[PDB]
A paper describes a structure:
Two antibodies, 13G10 and 14H7, were found to bind the porphyrin hapten with nanomolar affinities and enhance its peroxidase activity. 13G10 and 14H7 are murine monoclonal antibodies that were found to belong to the IgG1, λ-class. The anti-porphyrin antibodies 13G10 and 14H7, with a λ-light chain, were shown to possess shallow hapten binding pockets compared with the other structurally characterized catalytic antibodies.
The crystal structures of Fab 13G10 and Fab 14H7 were determined at 2.05 Å and 2.55 Å, respectively. Fab 13G10 crystallized with one molecule in the asymmetric unit, whereas the crystals of Fab 14H7 contained eight Fab molecules in the asymmetric unit and were pseudomerohedrally twinned. The hapten-binding pocket of 13G10 is a shallow cleft, roughly 12.7 Å by 7.2 Å wide and 8 Å deep, at the upper part of the VL/VH interface. In the most stable 13G10/Fe(ToCPP) predicted complex, the hydrophobic CDRH3 loop stacks against the most buried carboxyphenyl group of the porphyrin hapten and must therefore have been specifically selected by the immune system. In the calculated complex, the metal of the porphyrin is located close to the magnesium atom that has been characterized in the X-ray structure. Indeed, the deeper cavity observed in the structure of 13G10 compared with 14H7 comes mainly from the different conformations of CDRH3. However, no COOH side-chain of the 13G10 antibody is correctly localized to act as a general acid-base catalyst.
Numbering used by the authors:
A (entry chain L): 2 to 211
B (entry chain H): 3 to 105, 107 to 218
The structure:
């Protein structure tokens, strides 16, 4: 059976946010001892709720588990900035356990921040290797989701591009990098190159000309 | 309670055995579950084992792929994965159960299944150059390309440049890692006063200093 959770949700400090977990075959009961675990930066997992509504030792009182409709729920009362993380639920089926896809919870703990984009052309030294890597750094954006689009001579290119998952900086904003790899010859067959970053509906792009 | 080695480099076809040391409790009085984490399959349950009685329960995609054991003596639980493939590269967690609650989790063991050999990186200065953005502050950088295994360390001007430094996570291009780092300084400081990125790749004993020069 498949277990389903919301993909992402946003809330603010002090508010109540609720997360749900389906069983695909629904009918979530206390026979699934629904479990809730929190994933924070640098793969640190913390068990929050087990046996549907049992808080794990040491866990804050603001977390609580229950059943809502045919689903399992995780409620966070008076959400704290430190609660921004990913949440996974797990449903036990007598002999085995299955994890949901997890939910990324954003808890607005500072003002929205636009990403600072910098596009770097390939180095003269790298080109000597018949390789050309354009580097697009993206820092200080918040919330932590962003979409990167590369254009060459004005048209979209999805081949030879790699963008890292957003990582959390020290000031709690987010950063990410995107790469466009080309051969030096491909590099020379075009003039204009652009890295376009979309964040919360707004688009910022940086460009250069070979 | 739960200490797991942080990483294991394993060649394709080989086998790997990782541990999960317990502390702060009676190892024999709780279950130990094992979970695999990858971006394309999220978290997947592998199986569980009750050290007190030794019985074991596995998932379907892991019964013939893993073997859970536990040392009642050294308060340590183990997982053996066999015939590793690239699809087995992931982070493996152990988690103590009890009364239906997965209360404690280890920090996970990152298993890297790869044939690549120790490779030093190539370091390229990254300057604005072409249609950049003449402003107030200037952002410089350096590309640490094609090394193996992780990690590498980057500092600027031997460390003097500490404010405004960002080192991004590595991307894998075939079976080599690539990452970049940047530093933002006063436009009046550069190209005026020299800026150099210093890269190190311990695994290969490689060290390289590269100056950021106007394109
Ligand atoms: Mg039991």
């Amino acid at each position: 059976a498949v277990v389903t959770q919301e993909s992402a949700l946003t809330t603010s400090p002090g508010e109540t946010v609720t997360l749900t977990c389906r069983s695909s075959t629904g009918a979530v009961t206390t026979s699934n001892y629904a479990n809730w675990v929190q994933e924070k930066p640098d793969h640190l997992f913390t068990g929050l709720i087990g046996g549907t509504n049992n808080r794990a030792p040491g866990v804050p009182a603001r977390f609580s588990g229950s059943l809502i409709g045919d689903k399992a729920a995780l409620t966070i009362t008076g959400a704290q900035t430190e609660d921004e993380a990913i949440y996974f639920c797990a449903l036990w089926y007598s002999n085995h356990l299955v994890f949901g896809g997890g939910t990324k919870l954003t808890v607005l703990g500072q003002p929205k921040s636009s990403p600072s984009v910098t596009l770097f052309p390939p180095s003269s030294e790298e080109l000597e290797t018949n390789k050309a890597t354009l580097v697009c750094t993206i820092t200080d954006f918040y919330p932590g989701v962003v979409t990167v689009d590369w254009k060459v001579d004005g048209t979209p290119v999805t081949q030879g591009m790699e963008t890292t998952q957003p990582s959390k900086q020290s000031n709690n904003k987010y950063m990410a990098s995107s790469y466009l790899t080309l051969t030096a010859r491909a590099w020379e067959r075009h003039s204009s190159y652009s890295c376009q970053v979309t964040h919360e509906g707004h688009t910022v792009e940086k460009s250069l000309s070979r | 309670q739960l200490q797991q080695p942080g990483a294991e480099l394993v060649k394709p076809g080989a086998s790997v055995k990782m541990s999960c040391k317990a502390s702060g409790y009676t190892f024999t009085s709780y279950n130990m579950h094992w979970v695999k984490q990858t971006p394309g399959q999220g978290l997947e349950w592998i199986g569980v084992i009750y050290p007190g009685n030794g019985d074991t329960s596995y998932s379907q995609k892991f019964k013939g792929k893993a073997t859970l054991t536990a040392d009642k003596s050294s308060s340590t639980a183990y997982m053996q994965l066999s015939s590793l493939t690239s699809e087995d590269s992931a982070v493996y967690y152990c988690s103590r159960g009890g009364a239906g609650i997965m209360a404690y989790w280890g920090q996970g063991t990152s298993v890297t299944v790869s044939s690549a050999k120790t490779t030093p990186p190539s370091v390229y200065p990254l300057a604005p150059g072409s249609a950049a953005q003449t402003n107030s502050m200037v952002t410089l950088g350096c590309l640490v390309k094609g090394y193996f295994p992780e990690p590498v360390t980057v500092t600027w001007n031997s460390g003097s440049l500490s404010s405004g430094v960002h080192t991004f996570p590595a991307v894998l291009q075939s079976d080599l890692y690539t990452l970049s780092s940047s530093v933002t300084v006063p436009s009046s400081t550069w190209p005026s006063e020299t800026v150099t990125c210093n890269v190190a790749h311990p695994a290969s004993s490689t060290k390289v200093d590269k100056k950021i020069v106007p394109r």
